Description:
Layout: H1 15-18, E1 38-40, E2 53-59, E3 65-69, H2 76-85, E4 90-93, E5 98-99, E6 102-103, E7 114-118, E8 121-130, E9 134-143, E10 147-154, H3 167-181, E11 189-193, H4 198-216, H5 224-232, H6 242-258
Parallel strand pairs: 3-11, 4-10, 4-11
Antiparallel strand pairs: 1-2, 2-3, 5-6, 7-8, 8-9, 9-10
Helix pairs in contact: 4-5, 4-6
PDB class: hydrolase
Keywords: hydrolase, PTP1B
Assembly: monomeric
Amino acid sequence: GAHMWEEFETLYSRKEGQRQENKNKNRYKNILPFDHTRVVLHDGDPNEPVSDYINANIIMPKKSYIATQGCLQNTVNDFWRMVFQENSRVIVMTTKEVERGKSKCVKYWPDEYALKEYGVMRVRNVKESAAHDYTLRELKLSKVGERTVWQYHFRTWPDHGVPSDPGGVLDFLEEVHHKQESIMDAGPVVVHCSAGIGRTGTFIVIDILIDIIREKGVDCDIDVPKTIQMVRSQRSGMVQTEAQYRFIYMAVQHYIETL
């Protein structure tokens, strides 16, 4: 069940992220990907001494995730290299571009009915669908030298705290779940927020727990702290605040109530 038995307060090398060549690829100087789960980018420009780095980790709980930060202007091209290489077909964006006057993510997609080239990658935005809690962008990604990538852009997360009820997040996650399952052998679902750890960890942990309930039923063994620790062994500090922690339990409880 989804009861909170333990309080929030009860809750590996990062050498590549620490290298001088990669300093400007990190949004926050001290939030870095673990070496053992980082996404290693291949096929980089041979003129660049270091072309294999993005601040992102694979999260393996079948479904896997890439937890990453919001793009910086100088990491947009690497973000698309990552999506292409990993065969990702769904992107979950959990922030506005700007929140309370601070940039959280550079716009890395073209406007509806436009195409842009980001380095070696070509992205066409063929249709946007604007729901109460999110916008869905149907993107087409190809190497300049094609696959559909569905970007689910959550709109309603408050600029302070967490949503006071999880209905919007649950509806969003359910659409993401069906979309991912509709695409044969799709790669990891990309999930991002500013730093790629707070909102990103909250969405990923909820989704992991809901997927357990899908396979094992409403009465299955749930252990939220254990699940958070497991994700934290793959990217530092996933789930940042006590409100996020309480929100996870509330979302799973509500999910269970739908069944």
